[PDB]
Amino acid sequence: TGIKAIDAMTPIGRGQRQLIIGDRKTGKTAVCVDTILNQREAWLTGDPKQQVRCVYVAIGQKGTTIASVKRALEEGGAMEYTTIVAAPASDAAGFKWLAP
Amino acid sequence: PAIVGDEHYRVAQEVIRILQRYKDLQDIIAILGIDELSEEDKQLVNRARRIERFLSQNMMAAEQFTGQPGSTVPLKETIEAFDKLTKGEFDHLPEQAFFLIGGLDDLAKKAESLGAKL
Amino acid sequence: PAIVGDEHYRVAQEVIRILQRYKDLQDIIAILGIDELSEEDKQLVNRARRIERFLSQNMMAAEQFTGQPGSTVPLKETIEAFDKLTKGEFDHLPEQAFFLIGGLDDLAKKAESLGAKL
Amino acid sequence: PAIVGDEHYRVAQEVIRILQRYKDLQDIIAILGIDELSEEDKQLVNRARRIERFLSQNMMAAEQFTGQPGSTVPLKETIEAFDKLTKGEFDHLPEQAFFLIGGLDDLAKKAESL
Amino acid sequence: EAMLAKTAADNRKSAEQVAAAQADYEKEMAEARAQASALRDEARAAGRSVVDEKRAQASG
Amino acid sequence: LADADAMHAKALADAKAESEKVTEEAKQDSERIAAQLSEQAGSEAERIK
Amino acid sequence: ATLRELRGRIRSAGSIKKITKAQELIATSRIAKAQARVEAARPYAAEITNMLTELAGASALDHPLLVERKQPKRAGVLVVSSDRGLCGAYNANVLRRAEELFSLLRDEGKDPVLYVVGRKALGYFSFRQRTVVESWTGFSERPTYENAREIADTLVNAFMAGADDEGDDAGADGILGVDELHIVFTEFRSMLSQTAVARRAAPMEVEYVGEVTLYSFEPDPETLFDALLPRYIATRVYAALLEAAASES
Amino acid sequence: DVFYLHSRLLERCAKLSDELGGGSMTGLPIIETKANDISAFIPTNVISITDGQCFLESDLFNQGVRPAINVGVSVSRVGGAAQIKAMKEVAGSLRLDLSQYRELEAFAAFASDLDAASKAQLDRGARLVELLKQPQYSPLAVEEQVVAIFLGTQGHLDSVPVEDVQRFESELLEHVKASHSDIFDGIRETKKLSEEAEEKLVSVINEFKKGFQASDGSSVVV
Amino acid sequence: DGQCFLESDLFNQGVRPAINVGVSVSRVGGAAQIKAMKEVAGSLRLDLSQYRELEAFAAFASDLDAASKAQLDRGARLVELLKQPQYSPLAVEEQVVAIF
Amino acid sequence: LVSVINEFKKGFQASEALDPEDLEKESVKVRKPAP
Amino acid sequence: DLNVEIVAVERELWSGPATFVFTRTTAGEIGILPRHIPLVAQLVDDAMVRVEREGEDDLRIAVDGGFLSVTEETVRILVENAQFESEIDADAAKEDAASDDERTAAWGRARLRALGQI
C-alpha cells in the first residue's frame, strides 16, 4: 500500500480482503487512493506478475467527489492502470446496488 | 407555603436542597470518597447522610418483619427535628443513631445506646 | 497545505490537536482537578481554554441578541492570532478577554478593560 | 473436587493463586522494575515464572515446526509435578529448563542438559 | 613563592584552557552546521518559490 | 602550558578545516537540491499542460 | 441519547482509571523513597539520643525546656498535614486526632495554640475559624532538615516566651508564649497501618533506668546539654516530618 | 440476505492457483461507521467476512496521528506471509513496542519515577508513533519503508528529538536515494537486508546524523 | 421561537424558576424587550452560561486567579438575583432596576 | 439610581478527647537510678 | 587506627578507619588518636574536621552544627550539615562569608577553613 502503518502492522497480500473501516473524514479514501498510487512503480515495471490493475468502485458519492478522486489519480499517473466504476448519489438504487 | 405554612415549607426545601447536593456529589464520591470535597461539601454530605437515614422510620406494618413496634411522629416534632438536623445540631451523633426511629426522643435514646450523647 | 498554504494548515492542525487534548483532559479536570495534571498539560489546558474562547466571535447577525455590534477578521489576522495563541504568546491575558471579540486589536482593548495588557 | 478429586482441585487452585498474584505484580515489575519488589514477592515471581513456563508443552502438532516429537503427560503425573512446583521444589532450576517439555522425567533431563 | 604561585596559576590556566578550546571548537562546529542547514533550507525555500510561481504561471 | 596552547591552536586549525569542508558540502547539497526540485517542477508543468 | 451519555461516561471512567492507577504506582515508588529517608535518618537520632542521655546523667536536670511550668494555660500544637489531597483519610485522621487533643487540653485548662504544616489542615482550620499562629507549606512529601529546624526554632522560641507569661499578659517577653508543645502527625508503623498520634515534645520529662569509665565533657556538661537539647527537639521534629511523609505516601 | 450480498461480493477476491494462471484480486472494502460503533449490523457482517481490518479513528486523526490507524485493534490474519523478508525483520518488534508504549503513556510526565527500561520504552514508543505518520498522497516504496522502520526500531531515532523524527526520516531517505541508492537496490532485488547493507546503512545514518540539525538546534549525534 | 428548559435538578437546589440558562433561549431576543431591559441585560444569558461553565471547570481549582474569582462571585450574585418565588410578579421597571 | 443604591447600601444591614496516656511523652533517658 | 564517622541529621556522610582526627571544640583545638579517653564536646560554630588516614591524603570537612563524641570503640562527628573539600566552591565560600547573618557568616568561615585559605 505504500503506507508504513499498514505495510508494517497489518500487511496485505494479493488475494486478501482487507477492510478499511472508520468514521467519516478519517482518511479511508485517502488510504485506498494511496494504495492505488503506490501501484505506479509496479505498473511501470511492465511485468504482469508485478503489475497491479486497479478498480475503484464509487457508490453513492457525489459526482464532484468522484471527479476529485479521478483528478488525484491523474496527478500520480494512476489512471493508466485504474478503472473507475461510478454509481453517484443521483443514480438509481439499482446502480448503487450493482456497482460493486 | 400558602398551605403548610412558611416553617414547614422552608424546612422541606432545605432538606431537599441538601439531598440534591448530595446526589450531585455522588459522581465524585463514588470514585474518591468524601475526602476530596471542600469543607462545606464534607459538612453537607455528613448532614445529608444523617437526613436520609432519619427520613427512614420504624413502620407500624414493618413489625411483622422485624418484631420492632412502629412509631408515629407528630408533624410539629418532625418539622422541628428536621430543622435542627439541617442546622447541623446533630452533626456529632453517629449515622446509625438516625436509622429506623421515631422522633427526637427516640434519636436521643438510640444515640445513648451507641455511646454518643445528644 | 496545497490550497490554503503551509502556515494556515499548520496553525489549524495545531489548534485542532490542542483542542483534542483538552477534550481528553476534561474528565480528569472534572474529577481529580487540574492540579493533578502535568505541567505541560496545565499549560495546554490554559492555552486550549483561551483558544476555544477566541474561536468565539461577535457576529453582525447576533447583534439583536447580544446587543453588541459584530466584527470581521481578515484571514491573515486570524492565522497570525491563532499562531500566537498556540505558542502561548497570550497566556498572561485572562481567558475572559478572549470572549466574543474580533481580532487582536479587540483582544488588546478587552484585556485593557479587564486589567491586562499585551 | 466432586468431579476431579481433592488433590487435583487443590493443586490447580494453588497454581491459579500463584499465577494471579504474579499477574498482579506484573504492573509493578513493568513500571518500577523487580528491585522494588519484596523478597517474598521476588520468590513468588520466580516460582510463578517457572510454573507458567511448565504449563507449556511440546505438542504433537508442533513437531513439523520444531522437529522434536510431542509428549503426553499423564494426569496424575501432571498433578504431582505441579504440586511440587507450587510447594517450591524446583525454584533452583533455571527458567529455560521449563520450556516445552512433558513430565518430571523430561524436566530432569533438560535440567541436566543445562 | 612567586614560582610556586606561578606553577599553580599556570596549571589552573592550562586546565581551564583545554576545556575552553574544546568548547570553542564545539561552538564553531555547531555554528558551521547551522549555517549549512540554513543554506539547505534556503535552497529548498527558493525551489518552493520557483515551483509556486510555475504553478501560478501555468494556471494563468 | 606550552602543550595546551599548541593543542588549542591545532584544534582551531582543525576547526577551520572542517568548517570549510562542511560549508562546501552544504553548497554542493544545496545545488543538488535546487536542480532536483527544478526538474520536478518541470515535470509538474508538463503534467499541468 | 442515553447510550451516547453512557459511552461518554465509560470513556471518562476509563481515563480516571488510568490516572489513578498511574498515581498508585508512583505512590509505591514514593513510599520506597520515604522509607529510605527514614532509615537514613535513624542513626543520627539514636546516637544523639545517647549523647543527650550522657549529658543528662552528668548534669543538673533544671533546663527550662525540661521543667514543667506550674499551672500551664497554653499549648503549642503542631498539626502536620499534606499539601496534596489525594491521600484518602490521612488529613481527616490527623485532624480528628488534633481535635481530640484540643478537647483534652481544654479539659486540662490550657488554650491550644495552633501551628500547621501542610495546606490541607490550613483549609480545615480556615473553615473552622480557628486562627493559625503560623503555618508552613510546600514540603510535606520530601521535608528536609532545614524545614524541621525552622519549625523547631519557632516552637522552642514560643515555649521560652511562655516562661514569663502570667494570666494573659505577655510579661517582660512582650510575646505570649506557650507552656507546652505537642506534635500531631501520622506514624508509619507499616504499609497497612499508619496511625495518627499526638506526642508532647516539651517539657520533656525524665524517667530513670536503674543502671548500665565515665565521660569527659568540654567545656562542661551544663553548656553542652543546653546547646544539645534544642538540637534534640529539632531531630524529633524532623523524624516526625519524615514519618508523616512516609505515611502520606 | 444483506450478509449474503457482501459475502458473495467479497469471496470473489481470491488468489488463484497456478492451474488457473495464478492471478489474484485484492479487495479493499470501505465501511463508514457512526460514532465508531463497529458492532452495527453491516460493520459486523463485513468485519466477519474480511481477512483483516484497518480501524481508522477520529480521535487519532485529530491528535496528528495520520493515517489514523488504531494499531491496537487493526489486524491482518494473513500477517507476515504478506510481507517481504526485510519488512518482516524490521517490523517484528513494532507490535510489542507500540503496545508497551500505550501501556506506559500514562507515565509520560513521570519519567524520573520510571526505571531506565520503562523510560527507554516510552521514548522509543514516541519515536515509533512519529515514524508511522505519513503525509497524504505520498506512498513509500517498500525499500524506503524498510529503511524508515529500521531507523525507528534499531534505536537510530533515540538521539533525535521526537518532534524532528518525521523530518529526519524523510531527509535521510532523500539522502540515501541520492547517494547510497545501492541499499535500496539490494533490498528491492533480494527482498532482504544483508549484513553488509545493514552496516553501510548504519554508517550512512551516523554520518547524516552528524550533518543533521534539530529544530531546537541541539545535535543528534550519539 | 425558543424554549425555556426547566430542570428538576435546578428546582431542587433552589434555582426557582428552574430555567436552564445554558440551553434556554429566545429567538426574538432584544426586539421583545424594552430599551432599558435590553440595555441592562444584553449579555446576561451568555454571562450566566460562561459562569456555569467556569463553575463546573473550577470545582477543584485549589488556587484560582483574580479574574476567575471575580467571574464566579458575579455569577453567584446573578444566579441569586434571578431567583423568584411563585405568584410574585415584578413590573418591568422593577425588573430593570434589579438587573441593573 | 446609583446614588440611591449607595445610600441604601450604607443603610443596608447584611447578616471525645484523648486519654492523657494516649498522648505519648517524649523524655530524656537517665542512666542513673531513681532519686 | 580508629573508626571515624561523620553523620548528618539526614544521611550518614562518611565512615571508616583513620589515624588522627583534628577539630576545634568550643574549648579549643582537639586532636584525637586511637585510644583517646571517652569525650563529648561541641564543635565551634565555624568548625572544620581534618581526618588523617593511612596512605591517603587528609580529608578536610566544613561542619555546621557540630558535636564530637569520642568513645572507646569509635569517633563520631555529628553535623547539622557538612561539606567536603571537593564539594566546596571558593566563590560562594567568599560571598557567603562576610555576610551579615551570623549562621551564614559562620558557614562561610567553616567552608573557607575547610578549603585551606582560611
Ligand SMILES: Nc1ncnc2c1ncn2[C@@H]1O[C@H](COP(=O)(O)OP(=O)(O)OP(=O)(O)O)[C@@H](O)[C@H]1O
Ligand atoms: N495522511 C493524511 N495526512 C493528512 N491529511 C490527511 C491524510 N489522510 C487524509 N487526510 C485528510 O483527511 C480528510 C479526510 O480524508 P478522506 O476524505 O480521504 O477520508 P474519509 O474517511 O474517506 O472521508 P469521507 O467520510 O468524507 O468519505 C481529507 O481532508 C484528507 O485530505
Ligand SMILES: [Mg+2]
Ligand atoms: Mg471517503
